[PDB]
């Protein structure tokens, strides 16, 4: 969970999310909280088109992906798991 993938993806479903679950929710927040964290930690400066970094962040979203949820999604999630 060192990289904001998992809780997206097990939380928020097909792509990533806008920033204000993403800078303030729990699920996505206990990773990474955005763009300023993934754009000093990915290597790269992604943060400058949203579709762009989401892609190469969304490139890496098939990388840590078990086929079952695992620890981050609660039974009311938001609106629920």
Same mark, same amino acid.
Request: glycine content about 6%.
């Given at each position: 969970?060192?990289?904001?993938?998992?809780?997206?993806?097990?939380?928020?479903?097909?792509?990533?999310?806008?920033?204000?679950?993403?800078?303030?929710? *729990?699920? &996505?927040?206990?990773?990474?909280?955005?763009? #300023?964290?993934?754009?000093?930690? +990915?290597? /790269? %400066?992604?943060?400058?088109?949203?579709?762009?970094?989401?892609?190469?962040? *969304?490139? &890496?979203?098939?990388?840590?992906?078990?086929? #079952?949820?695992?620890?981050?999604? +609660?039974? /009311? %999630?938001?609106?629920?798991?």
């Amino acid at each position: 969970m060192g990289i904001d993938y998992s809780g997206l993806r097990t939380i928020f479903g097909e792509k990533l999310p806008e920033s204000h679950i993403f800078f303030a929710t *729990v699920a &996505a927040h206990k990773y990474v909280p955005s763009y #300023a964290f993934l754009r000093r930690e +990915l290597g /790269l %400066s992604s943060a400058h088109t949203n579709r762009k970094v989401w892609k190469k962040f *969304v490139e &890496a979203y098939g990388k840590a992906i078990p086929p #079952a949820p695992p620890a981050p999604p +609660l039974t /009311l %999630s938001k609106l629920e798991h």
